[PDB]
Structure formats: structure tokens, C-alpha cells
């Protein structure tokens with residue numbers, strides 16, 4: 001079917017067609033951020049006298 | 050220079066994809082080299098430069114229009130001198146001089162316009178005189194030794210016998226040449242004169 | 247050399263050639279043999295003797 | 297095959313070739329014949345015998361210091377000039393550079409013996 | 410304005426360099442430097458090479474009949490190239506040269522036949 005879509009045809013002639021690449025899909029995601037525990041000083045920046 | 054002539058800011062932006070300039074130069078260089086190779090393969094067939102013999106009777110055969118004319122400052126044959134005068138080149142010499150392009154503003158010379166935009170024409174490796182020397186060597190060899198010249202050592206032969214062999218080659222018995230030698234030489238000489246005209 | 251290839255070194259039967267130099271190229275002068283006056287004779291493939 | 301094209305299959309006169317393979321290409325070995333040692337001989341267009349003009353059939357007339365011989369063009373191997381080596385066409389009046397010498401007839405001694 | 414090219418002996422041998430200024434006529438400015446060894450060719454003013462009267466076969470071509478090489482204490486030199494060996498044939502109306510011997514010679518010729526095949530996935 002990949003060959004048929006590439007060729008815009010519902011008929012394929014005898015021969016060898018290239019069909020893109022073998023692909024691998026991801027299964028899960030990894031999220032890594034530094035282990036920061038404090039909230040930023042929003043009060044000091046925006047609530048200053 | 051073509052893209053960012055005299056602009057620092059443009060140059061710094063060109064550098065964001067300047068690998069393309071390199072490839073353009075690589076391609077043009079390959080052509081430039083090939084063009085000298087082509088010249089050498091066509092003309093430098095023989096690396097033995099045979100001196101053009103003194104003109105002596107070759108059996109009625111007159112080669113003066115194909116052999117170099119010694120009275121000229123550049124020893125071109127009369128026919129070559131004509132060929133060179135007929136083909137017109139855009140300019141001559143490979144030195145243009147900034148000072149001359151700066152001075153002659155009024156002419157609006159196309160060659161200077163090309164130079165200022167980074168477009169350069171390079172000189173050939175062999176000069177016209179060098180080409181003429183190869184041509185003369187080939188003719189000198191042909192006249193004194195026929196084809197033995199190309200095969201190996203140049204073996205001297207009387208010009209009329211060279212022709213006899215050429216006649217047997219096409220399929221006409223050699224006695225024809227010897228019997229009609231004056232006729233053949235006259236037709237030959239006539240034909241060459243017609244070509245120059 | 248001398249060539250047997252038809253029209254390779256000019257029309258007619260090739261005898262010899264002489265190069266001449268030109269800007270950006272080469273000019274060849276090709277000398278060939280061309281049949282001229284001719285006559286029609288009766289022919290035969292063979293002669294029968296005895 | 298065997299080529300007759302000048303410089304097509306190498307320099308000299310071509311005899312034969314042998315291919316060898318190579319990565320992405322072909323290499324040819326071209327075997328050719330090259331003339332080597334040579335000598336300077338006197339020559340002439342024709343030999344005059346009895347007033348008739350003799351031309352070589354397959355060769356050139358060659359003279360050493362005292363005698364005329366006929367040789368094949370590409371190799372110095374002198375033969376006696378005979379009526380079998382020459383052909384006759386016309387008389388001794390037209391060709392420029394005719395020399396005399398004699399032409400041998402192999403039949404005359406048989407008729408005499 | 411332009412016109413600059415550099416003649417280099419390989420760097421695994423030496424770092425001497427000659428520079429050709431294509432649009433400069435020294436017969437001397439619009440150059441980066443001089444330092445003598447200035448030779449005018451029809452291809453430009455060549456600075457940093459010694460011209461010699463000894464014609465040789467060409468090594469590094471420059472243009473207009475001029476070619477360079479690196480030689481004897483070695484420096485960059487320039488010369489007009491030789492086109493071939495000088496030779497001469499006799500021409501006479503009554504003398505012929507005929508081979509008496511021969512050589513069997515075998516030479517080689519090399520030709521490409523095929524190019525590496527590739528394929529590209531644009532994605």
C-alpha cells in the first residue's frame with residue numbers, strides 16, 4: 001500500500017520499489033528537570049513597596 | 050562580492066548558509082581545469098616537436114598556406130592568421146587594471162561591470178603561440194614521415210611516395226599517382242588556395 | 247593516419263589531413279579523392295574459357 | 297578483434313588486447329607492435345627494365361650502396377626484383393625519378409636448361 | 410577589485426607561498442605585500458617566486474604559458490613550460506627510412522564504468 005500511495009496508483013507493475021524506511025515509534029516519555037523545590041520570588045518582584 | 054558587495058551586515062548574514070558559496074566555486078573550478086585538459090588532448094598528441102623543414106620542392110605540392118609564415122610577429126600560417134582575425138573575442142589580455150576601470154567611467158565597459166561584481170575570466174594555460182607550435186609540429190611530421198610519425202619513430206619518406214601509399218590505401222593502384230603527379234599536385238594546390246578565399 | 251570510416255575525415259575517399267589552429271578550437275583541412283568522369287561498360291561475373 | 301584505428305587501442309600498431317576488472321571500472325592491456333631500429337636507404341618510384349616501367353606490388357624499391365631490392369614497407373627484408381614482385385604499367389618516359397637496374401625473369405633459365 | 414590566487418607547495422613539505430595578483434601590472438601596488446621576487450606574467454603579477462630561464466615540464470600551472478614548481482635551500486620558482494622534446498626529421502626526395510627490427514609493447518588504459526548508486530529519503 002505504501003508503494004501504491006507513492007505511485008498514485010491502485011496498480012503496481014512488476015519490479016522493486018523503494019518504500020521509505022523502517023521506523024520505530026516511541027512508547028513512553030521522559031521528563032527531566034532539576035529537582036528545584038522553591039517558588040520564585042513573585043512577591044518581591046511584583047509586590048514591592 | 051556578488052551577493053554582499055561592500056556590506057558587512059550582508060556578509061554576516063551570508064555566513065548563515067555560506068557552505069553554498071563553496072560548492073559553487075568547487076563546480077566552476079572543475080570546469081576551469083577541464084578546459085585546459087581538453088586543449089592538451091586535442092593538440093599535444095605528439096610531444097616531439099619537429100622543426101618545420103625548409104621549403105623545398107615536395108614534388109609540386111605547395112604547403113605554404115598551411116605552414117607558418119616566418120614574416121609574421123607570430124608565426125601563424127596564412128590560413129590560421131585569417132581564422133584568428135575572423136573570430137572576435139570580448140576582450141584581450143587578462144590584466145584589466147583597477148586604475149583603468151576607475152578612470153574610464155564614461156565607457157561603461159561591460160568587462161569592468163563584471164569585475165566589480167566578482168565575475169572573473171581566467172587565462173588559458175597554453176597561449177596561442179604554444180598551440181601554433183603544436184600544430185606546426187604535427188604538420189612538419191606529416192609532411193616528412195606520413196603516419197610513421199604517430200606510430201613510433203618518424204621515418205623519412207619522399208612526399209610523392211607518401212601519396213602513393215595513400216592512393217593504394219583508398220584502392221587506386223599507385224602507378225596512377227606517378228603518371229598523373231603533375232595533375233594531382235596542381236589540383237591540390239588549387240584547392241588549398243580556394244579554402245583561404 | 248588515414249581513415250576508412252565513411253565521411254569521418256570528410257566526404258569522398260580520405261587521403262590525408264592537416265590541422266590549423268583557431269581561437270577556442272581546431273580547424274581541419276581534409277584532403278579527399280573524388281571519382282569524376284565515368285563510363286558505363288557491360289559486365290559479367292566470370293569468364294568461361296575451356 | 298583487431299583495430300586499425302590510430303591511437304584507439306594504444307600507441308603503435310595494434311595486435312590484441314586483454315581486459316582486467318577493477319572497482320567501478322575496466323582496465324585494458326593493449327599489445328602493440330612498434331618499429332625499432334631503422335636504416336637510411338636510397339629509393340625510387342620505379343625500375344626501368346626494357347623500356348617498360350616496373351612498380352612494386354607490395355613494397356618499396358630500396359637501394360643499398362650498389363644494388364636495388366624490393367622490401368615490404370614495414371620491415372627490412374630485401375628481395376630480388378623480379379617479374380613476380382613487380383607489375384608493369386606504361387613505359388619509362390613519364391615517371392619522375394625512374395632508375396634502371398634490371399628485373400629478373402625466373403623462367404628464362406628453365407627454357408635454357 | 411579583485412583577482413587573487415595562491416600557489417602552494419604542499420604544506421607537508423614547506424610553508425612558502427607565492428601569490429598571484431591577476432589584475433596587477435608591476436611593470437607594483439594593490440598587493441598585500443611585495444618583498445621582491447616580483448615577476449610579471451600575462452596572468453598577473455606573481456610575488457614570492459623566482460623566475461628562471463630554464464624551461465621544464467609543468468607541475469603547478471599558473472596560466473599564459475607560465476608554470477611553477479618548488480626546487481633548490483628550496484624555493485618557489487616560475488618558468489615558461491616546455492611543450493615537448495626538440496626533434497627533427499630529414500626530408501629528401503630520394504631517401505627512405507625502413508625499420509629493421511621491432512618492439513612488442515604493452516600499455517594500459519583505465520576507464521570508469523559505473524558510479525555509486527544511492528537513494529534518499531527526503532523525510
Ligand SMILES: *[C@@H]1O[C@H](CO)[C@@H](O[C@@H]2O[C@H](CO)[C@@H](O)[C@H](O)[C@H]2NC(C)=O)[C@H](O)[C@H]1NC(C)=O
Pocket residue numbers: 104110111112113242
Ligand atoms: C605557393 O603558392 C603561392 C601563391 O598562392 C606562391 O606565392 C607567390 O609567389 C610569387 C613569386 O615569389 C610572388 O610574386 C607572389 O606575390 C606570391 N603570391 C602570394 C599570394 O603570396 C608561392 O611562391 C608558392 N610556393 C611554392 C613552394 O610553390
Ligand SMILES: *[C@@H]1O[C@H](CO)[C@@H](O[C@@H]2O[C@H](CO)[C@@H](O)[C@H](O)[C@H]2NC(C)=O)[C@H](O)[C@H]1NC(C)=O
Pocket residue numbers: 232235236
Ligand atoms: C582529368 O581531369 C583534369 C582536371 O579537369 C583534366 O586536366 C585539365 O585539362 C584542361 C584541358 O587540357 C586544361 O585546360 C586544365 O588546365 C587541366 N587541369 C589541370 C589541373 O591541369 C584532364 O585532362 C582530365 N583527363 C585525363 C586525366 O585523362
Ligand SMILES: *[C@@H]1O[C@H](CO)[C@@H](O[C@@H]2O[C@H](CO)[C@@H](O)[C@H](O)[C@H]2NC(C)=O)[C@H](O)[C@H]1NC(C)=O
Pocket residue numbers: 360361362363
Ligand atoms: C648490397 O647487397 C649485395 C647482395 O647481398 C652485396 O653483394 C654481395 O656481397 C657478398 C660479400 O659480402 C658477395 O659474396 C656476393 O657475391 C655479392 N653479391 C653480388 C650480387 O654482388 C653488396 O655488397 C651490398 N652493397 C653494399 C654497398 O653493401
Ligand SMILES: *[C@@H]1O[C@H](CO)[C@@H](O[C@@H]2O[C@H](CO)[C@@H](O)[C@H](O)[C@H]2NC(C)=O)[C@H](O)[C@H]1NC(C)=O
Pocket residue numbers: 344394395396
Ligand atoms: C637507362 O638505359 C637507357 C639506355 O638503354 C638510357 O637511355 C639513353 O639516355 C641518353 C642520355 O644522354 C640518351 O642520349 C639516349 O638516346 C638514351 N637511349 C635510349 C635507347 O633511350 C637511360 O638514360 C638510362 N636511365 C637511367 C636512369 O640510368
Ligand SMILES: *[C@@H]1O[C@H](CO)[C@@H](O)[C@H](O)[C@H]1NC(C)=O
Pocket residue numbers: 042043046047
Ligand atoms: C501583595 O500583598 C497583598 C496584601 O496586602 C496580598 O493579598 C497579595 O496576594 C500580594 N501579592 C503577591 C504577588 O504576593
Ligand SMILES: *[C@@H]1O[C@H](CO)[C@@H](O)[C@H](O)[C@H]1NC(C)=O
Pocket residue numbers: 334335336499506
Ligand atoms: C638518416 O639520415 C639523416 C640525415 O642525414 C640523419 O640525421 C640520421 O641520423 C640518419 N639515420 C638513421 C637511419 O638512423
Ligand SMILES: *[C@@H]1O[C@H](CO)[C@@H](O)[C@H](O)[C@H]1NC(C)=O
Pocket residue numbers: 392393502503
Ligand atoms: C631531388 O632534388 C635534387 C635537388 O636537391 C634534384 O637535383 C633531383 O633531380 C631531384 N630528384 C627527383 C627524383 O625529384
Ligand SMILES: *[C@@H]1O[C@H](CO)[C@@H](O)[C@H](O)[C@H]1NC(C)=O
Pocket residue numbers: 142144434436449450451452453
Ligand atoms: C604592463 O605595462 C607595460 C607598459 O604599458 C606593457 O608594455 C606590458 O605589456 C604590461 N604587462 C602586461 C602583463 O600586460
